[PDB]
Amino acid sequence: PISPIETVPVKLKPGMDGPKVKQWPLTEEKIKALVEICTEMEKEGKISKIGPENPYNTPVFAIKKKDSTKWRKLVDFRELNKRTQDFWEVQLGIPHPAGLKKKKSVTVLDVGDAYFSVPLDEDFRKYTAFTIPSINNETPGIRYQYNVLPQGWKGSPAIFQSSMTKILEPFKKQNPDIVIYQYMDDLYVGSDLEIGQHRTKIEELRQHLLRWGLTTPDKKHQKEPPFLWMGYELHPDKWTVQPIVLPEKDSWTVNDIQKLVGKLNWASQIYPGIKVRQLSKLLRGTKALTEVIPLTEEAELELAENREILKEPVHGVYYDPSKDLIAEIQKQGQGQWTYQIYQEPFKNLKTGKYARMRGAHTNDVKQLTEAVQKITTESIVIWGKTPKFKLPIQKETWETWWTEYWQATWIPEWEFVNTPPLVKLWYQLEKEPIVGAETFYVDGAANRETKLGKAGYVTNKGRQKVVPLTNTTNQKTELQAIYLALQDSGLEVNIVTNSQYALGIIQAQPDKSESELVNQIIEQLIKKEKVYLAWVPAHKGIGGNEQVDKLVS
Amino acid sequence: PIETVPVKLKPGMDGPKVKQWPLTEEKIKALVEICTEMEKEGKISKIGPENPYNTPVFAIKKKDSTKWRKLVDFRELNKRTQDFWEVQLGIPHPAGLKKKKSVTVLDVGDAYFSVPLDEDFRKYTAFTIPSINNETPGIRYQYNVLPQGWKGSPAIFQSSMTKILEPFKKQNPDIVIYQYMDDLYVGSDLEIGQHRTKIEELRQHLLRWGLTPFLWMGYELHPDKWTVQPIVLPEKDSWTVNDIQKLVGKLNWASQIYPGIKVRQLSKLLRGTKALTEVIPLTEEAELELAENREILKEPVHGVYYDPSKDLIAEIQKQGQGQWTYQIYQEPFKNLKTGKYARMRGAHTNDVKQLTEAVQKITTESIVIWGKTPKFKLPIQKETWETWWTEYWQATWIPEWEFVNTPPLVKLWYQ
DNA sequence: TGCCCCCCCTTCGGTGCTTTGCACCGAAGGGGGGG
Ligand SMILES: Nc1nc(=O)n([C@@H]2CS[C@H](COP(=O)(O)OP(=O)(O)OP(=O)(O)O)O2)cc1F
Ligand SMILES: OC[C@H]1O[C@@](CO)(O[C@H]2O[C@H](CO)[C@@H](O)[C@H](O)[C@H]2O)[C@@H](O)[C@@H]1O
Ligand SMILES: [Ca+2]
Ligand SMILES: [N+]
Numbered sequence A: 001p002i003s004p005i006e007t008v009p010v011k012l013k014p015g016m017d018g019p020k021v022k023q024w025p026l027t028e029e030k031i032k033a034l035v036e037i038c039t040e041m042e043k044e045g046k047i048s049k050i051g052p053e054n055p056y057n058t059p060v061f062a063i064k065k066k067d068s069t070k071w072r073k074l075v076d077f078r079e080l081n082k083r084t085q086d087f088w089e090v091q092l093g094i095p096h097p098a099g100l101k102k103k104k105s106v107t108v109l110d111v112g113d114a115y116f117s118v119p120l121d122e123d124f125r126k127y128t129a130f131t132i133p134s135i136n137n138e139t140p141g142i143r144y145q146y147n148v149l150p151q152g153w154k155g156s157p158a159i160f161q162s163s164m165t166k167i168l169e170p171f172k173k174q175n176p177d178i179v180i181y182q183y184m185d186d187l188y189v190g191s192d193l194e195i196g197q198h199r200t201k202i203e204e205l206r207q208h209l210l211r212w213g214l215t216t217p218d219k220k221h222q223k224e225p226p227f228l229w230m231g232y233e234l235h236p237d238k239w240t241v242q243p244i245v246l247p248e249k250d251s252w253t254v255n256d257i258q259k260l261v262g263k264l265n266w267a268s269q270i271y272p273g274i275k276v277r278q279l280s281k282l283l284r285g286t287k288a289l290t291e292v293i294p295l296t297e298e299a300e301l302e303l304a305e306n307r308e309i310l311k312e313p314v315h316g317v318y319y320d321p322s323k324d325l326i327a328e329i330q331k332q333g334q335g336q337w338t339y340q341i342y343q344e345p346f347k348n349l350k351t352g353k354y355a356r357m358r359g360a361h362t363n364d365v366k367q368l369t370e371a372v373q374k375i376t377t378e379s380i381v382i383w384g385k386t387p388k389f390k391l392p393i394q395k396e397t398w399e400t401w402w403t404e405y406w407q408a409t410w411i412p413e414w415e416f417v418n419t420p421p422l423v424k425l426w427y428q429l430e431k432e433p434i435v436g437a438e439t440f441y442v443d444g445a446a447n448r449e450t451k452l453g454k455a456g457y458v459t460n461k462g463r464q465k466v467v468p469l470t471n472t473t474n475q476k477t478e479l480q481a482i483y484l485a486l487q488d489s490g491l492e493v494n495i496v497t498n499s500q501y502a503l504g505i506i507q508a509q510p511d512k513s514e515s516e517l518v519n520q521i522i523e524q525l526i527k528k529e530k531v532y533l534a535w536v537p538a539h540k541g542i543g544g545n546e547q548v549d550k551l552v553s
Numbered sequence B: 001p002i003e004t005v006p007v008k009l010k011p012g013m014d015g016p017k018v019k020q021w022p023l024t025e026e027k028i029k030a031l032v033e034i035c036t037e038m039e040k041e042g043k044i045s046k047i048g049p050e051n052p053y054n055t056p057v058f059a060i061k062k063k064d065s066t067k068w069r070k071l072v073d074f075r076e077l078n079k080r081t082q083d084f085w086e087v088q089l090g091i092p093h094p095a096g097l098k099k100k101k102s103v104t105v106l107d108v109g110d111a112y113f114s115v116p117l118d119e120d121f122r123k124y125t126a127f128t129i130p131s132i133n134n135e136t137p138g139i140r141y142q143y144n145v146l147p148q149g150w151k152g153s154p155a156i157f158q159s160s161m162t163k164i165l166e167p168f169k170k171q172n173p174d175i176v177i178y179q180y181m182d183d184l185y186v187g188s189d190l191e192i193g194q195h196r197t198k199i200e201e202l203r204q205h206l207l208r209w210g211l212t213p214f215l216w217m218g219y220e221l222h223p224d225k226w227t228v229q230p231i232v233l234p235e236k237d238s239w240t241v242n243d244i245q246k247l248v249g250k251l252n253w254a255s256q257i258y259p260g261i262k263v264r265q266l267s268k269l270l271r272g273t274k275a276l277t278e279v280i281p282l283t284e285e286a287e288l289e290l291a292e293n294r295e296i297l298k299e300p301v302h303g304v305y306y307d308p309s310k311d312l313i314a315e316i317q318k319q320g321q322g323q324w325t326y327q328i329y330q331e332p333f334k335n336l337k338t339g340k341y342a343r344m345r346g347a348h349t350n351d352v353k354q355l356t357e358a359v360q361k362i363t364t365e366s367i368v369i370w371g372k373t374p375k376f377k378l379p380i381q382k383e384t385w386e387t388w389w390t391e392y393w394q395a396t397w398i399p400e401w402e403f404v405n406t407p408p409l410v411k412l413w414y415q
Numbered sequence C: 001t002g003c004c005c006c007c008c009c010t011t012c013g014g015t016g017c018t019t020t021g022c023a024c025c026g027a028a029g030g031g032g033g034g035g
Helices: A028-044 A078-083 A122-128 A155-173 A195-210 A254-267 A277-283 A297-311 A364-383 A395-404 A474-488 A500-507 A516-527 A543-551 B025-040 B075-080 B109-114 B119-125 B152-171 B192-211 B241-254 B264-268 B284-298 B351-370 B382-391
Strands: A060-064 A071-075 A105-110 A130-132 A142-146 A179-183 A186-191 A227-229 A232-234 A238-241 A326-331 A337-344 A347-354 A388-391 A414-416 A438-446 A453-459 A464-469 A492-497 A530-535 B044-047 B057-060 B069-072 B102-107 B127-129 B139-143 B176-180 B183-188 B218-221 B313-320 B323-331 B334-342 B375-379 B401-404
Touching: A028 A060, A028 A071, A028 A130, A028 A142, A060 A130, A078 A122, A105 A195, A105 A227, A122 A142, A155 A179, A155 A195, A186 A195, A186 A227, A254 A277, A254 A297, A277 A297, A326 A364, A337 A364, A347 A364, A364 A388, A364 A395, A364 B382, A438 A474, A438 A543, A453 A474, A453 A543, A464 A474, A474 A492, A474 A500, A474 A516, A492 A543, A500 A516, A500 A530, A530 B241, B025 B044, B025 B057, B025 B069, B025 B127, B057 B127, B075 B119, B102 B192, B109 B152, B109 B192, B119 B139, B152 B176, B152 B192, B176 B351, B183 B192, B183 B351, B241 B264, B241 B284, B264 B284, B313 B351, B323 B351, B334 B351, B351 B375, B351 B382, B382 B401
Parallel strands: A326 A388, A388 A414, A438 A492, A492 A530, B313 B375, B375 B401
Antiparallel strands: A060 A071, A105 A186, A130 A142, A179 A186, A227 A232, A232 A238, A326 A337, A337 A347, A438 A453, A453 A464, B044 B139, B057 B069, B102 B183, B102 B218, B127 B139, B176 B183, B313 B323, B323 B334
């Protein structure tokens, strides 16, 4: 006699009624394999048959298990999901083996027929109705309603997952010497107990679960390493991911590149140095998923470099709380960053990468800061603390950046590691006008209708320029005016603009941009030795600003 | 045997559904201990996924305090909860609190746990306690009593609050007491020794009801010493073209606040196309223009007053070298207060801690002056703030905020 | 031709000041992974 698992109250959204979707045609091969499964649920009591007073129905189908000889029954509750109340998911994240502490004895279990061992809400079972063709629609057929959590219902995962925790709660509290990682029905259990005591507690747990109707078949009972868990392989002292299959196809479609970049990301968690910039760059564009893409010279090398990393088998280690966490970052070029997290040198807990390009104009320091923020949050999730950082940026560079930037920014306790390429600021704007340097009053303007414009300057030494521009905008002409002044001035220059737009961009010392023009401006700024930018209001009759504003307007 | 005050949400509004953010090991351990004790005492009870609502939770340590304190980010629930002023349960704000020489802030939120919460409203207080490395799915709870940090707690508890304070208020008629969220603000013009003595009396006065994070803590304010930061124009004996350009820019900006400011005579000095470092003398007309502009900036702005029905907004500029400027307003260019902070904790080493301190300081001043907390415009990237601010939060409330990126083209509030 | 969670990369539309162009950001659809 099992302990009845208390039902979770479930309701439909107000004013909404059950689903009525009927069934789509099914192949005879599938219609046949289905009825056999339905009858088994009838026997075990998982499904009741009486359905004449039930006006609802939801389509049904089936697919096979992952490399198994068993079909899987699925119900398209998409319509019922819309009319069902909203739930708060209790699954907040995915455990990671680098967060595990070493244990002397370990076990991995799986609950057999998880969803079908949890009693569904009495009042809700009527809406889970579904019809299966008896014989190609020759006869009417067998209708059923679910007595337990079904597959396809948005409420099944959260309900089963919450019930699984209520069942385990008394076992854990009465056995604090044990660790249990519960992810759905998958179960990890480890202790430093003698193997004999461990097997004892394990069977006590198996009995506890069976006491609430939860079976733990021996086919899924892992007793010997390497334990397969969450897509990894858990050895006593080291862990690793399960082998990665890289498609080596010679003709690449859009979807092929998507699958490739996906596996590379998954591999980046332990294989250090993975890059996907040039490969993903092939994916940018409104191409159909089937269109064939020829790999670029850069993309082909990036794939080759990754292949070399994956050739060798890599393993991570487990977590020792008595030791500090170290996070080390290296710049990979073109806004790419890899890192390693470890407690002892060369024994990584895990690796990862950051390549997000956020913002039209940025620099390496901002990106290194973003990488630090990613690693910090990731570290809190997996271990609940911040690692000490080893960064390829000089204390002086960082001090110069964060003290001068107008936004608040910060990096937790960190030290410099001399591992080129180093991060640096590529130019510095003066805080005061430069004595004896030519003063360029720059300005630009464009016609909103014809999109034609002008950019130019006038200097205190009589130097002047106006350049005509086509297919442009006010903002672009303002950048162009600044660009001209940089090209036409010596190594030191004062520049007076009225473009808040251009000044905001440049004052943040970007070193990279999606704008060809801004990149050209950066290339000039790096060549200068002193550059003072100043803003003045327009149409105030100011110095060369009134003069330059008439020229280009 | 206490009847519960029925509470409703604002019509046409669902409950809060805010995700729980990751917690450091020290904060989770504190929460698991705090909730284990609150569950034994019935103040909270476990719930399941059938409850669709959720509010973030974490833990803080107040200034010079070594013990943890649970903090629920009820900002979303507080915005959706019925305004109790319409229910007449609003707490009036005393204009004389800012005038007292001293003001102590006592954490009285603990008393809210004695009052039960409306059954039908408890589902809206749901929160989830996470686990390290996601070993255990989220463990969800909900409140059965008045939870700390919810705007309804002090409102419902006010009827009980006034009675407890009855005897002390009648014995000390010159003392001001204001209630905001979990805090009590007690001000006097007494000497510090006598002031701290009266505060100790109020504590023991509370335990007289207690027998019938903790209360022992208190923080001292001195609003009579609070100063403002006006817009100032430098004083130079010689000016360069660049100086006058900056000045014309600043004045042109300031004219949105003071409509009488003129720059016509100063602009004409920049008539040529001169080198930025060229020293140019002030004309007779420009000399009077500058002096008259300084005069305008001395007097107050016309038509700026506090409207109790409008939200407060606070902007903050990082000026560098540990300096931080701020303005509080309800209508743009109608600042109710402008100020500056310097040499706070974090100065010269940690921007985020300093800004965190600034937000707390400004909120504390808004509560004392208007009984409102402002919505902040923060000069920081969203990700940078969300990664660190909880490491330095020391207040039992949390203000609303948004993120801005305003390059300082004109150093308007700090020369 | 299902359900729930996490991650990265690209796209796209809403939003607000740089303003009617441009920058930012969150949602979503693609992929990887877990059950
Ligand atoms: N593709 C999947 N869809 C699902 O709805 N599930 C759900 C959530 S986890 C739950 C587990 O199913 P049951 O235990 O029968 O399924 P199982 O294959 O994991 O386990 P087993 O055959 O009972 O040992 O099914 C799993 C899938 F892999
Ligand atoms: O930093 C804001 C950030 O916080 C979230 C989730 O915690 O919402 C909280 O903060 C908002 C900003 O003040 C509040 O409006 C909201 O009520 C509160 O829950 C996110 O929504 C937001 O990105
Ligand atoms: Ca299973
Ligand atoms: N113009």
